[PDB]
Amino acid sequence: MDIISVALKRHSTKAFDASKKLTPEQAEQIKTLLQYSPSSTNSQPWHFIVASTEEGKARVAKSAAGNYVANERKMLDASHVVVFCAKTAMDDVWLKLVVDQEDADGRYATPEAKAANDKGRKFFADMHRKDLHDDAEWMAKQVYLNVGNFLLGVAALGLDAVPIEGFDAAILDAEFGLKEKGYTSLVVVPVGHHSVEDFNATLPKSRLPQNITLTEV
């Protein structure tokens, strides 16, 4: 089926079949999607935790215990659980890693082109770090864009998923020592195959009409 079929038919999975696992092929495919997301200035201001062990999933699921138990079971029963993390600050060392990797990949003909690109990336980075002091929000936005890309990609692979904001980020950060590493957890996405308990697999999709949300000019 075409990508519009995928967009109309994917859903937020509310219950996962704990017997059904990604193939080793699908495990590699979902990591490719995470890696190859676009981002502003190719800043890639992100870390992914991909929990596939029973222990790893249980460690992520701690973030949902008590106040978010419906979300806790999705993290325990899915095959693979992705934690989307943003960097907590945009530093020149990260931007150097990115330009060096672009240089390794051969995107710069001359040291002058490499310098020009670094200069331009820094201009955008400084609008956030220095002028607006919103660089943490700007990086977080790029991570959400990756989630958007990710949810559509895993649906087109024929996999079930659910994006989760209902979790305790302080608990999840502490569990994986993310603050010390320069990251903060934003979104958790369990990936797998829905079970018969997934009420949402058969509910109609609901969106506002285009005559409310979309202007043509």
Place this chain on the structure above:
Amino acid sequence: MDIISVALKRHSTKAFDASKKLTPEQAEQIKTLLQYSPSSTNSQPWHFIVASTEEGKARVAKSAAGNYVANERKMLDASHVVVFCAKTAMDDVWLKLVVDQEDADGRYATPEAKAANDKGRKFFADMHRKDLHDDAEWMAKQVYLNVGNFLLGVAALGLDAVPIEGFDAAILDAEFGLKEKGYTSLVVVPVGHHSVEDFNATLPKSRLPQNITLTEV
């Protein structure tokens, strides 16, 4: 084209062929993708401007005149230009439109299920607009998730696109009267077909290795 091939072969178009237009089918398909993006609590806190006339695109392109000239040319040369807008405040009238639509689309068996889901959505909204005072940032994150969905989607339709943060949002908001309508422009995505001047169509994609960005547990 499997979706991993789409993810690995899509690119940020640096120049559009102004003679190559979306087909009528494609023009409807890109609007479906905008509408059916997921969002936290199905909040859909967004407006889209789709500019396809010369006059409409020129009005968008004013936001990039002067200090973003490359971006200006992309907006003038693409077939269709999408302005992604966030709501500036999460109000109870928008939450009522959303739950009334979910009710009209058949997601609720009883008035009780509807009130229950309305109160659940209000708990989340209130965390942002009452506790954290970050509903503007929260809604802007949902719009960036829509953008991530959209860029992979249009690539799967065989269309070229580039996401643009390099514009003046104050000029664009003024040009369409967005502030008074309760919205702000976040990202501009020209859609169409790349030209011969698109140097980025023949460069390999560059991303940080998984051994930096990705921990398996």
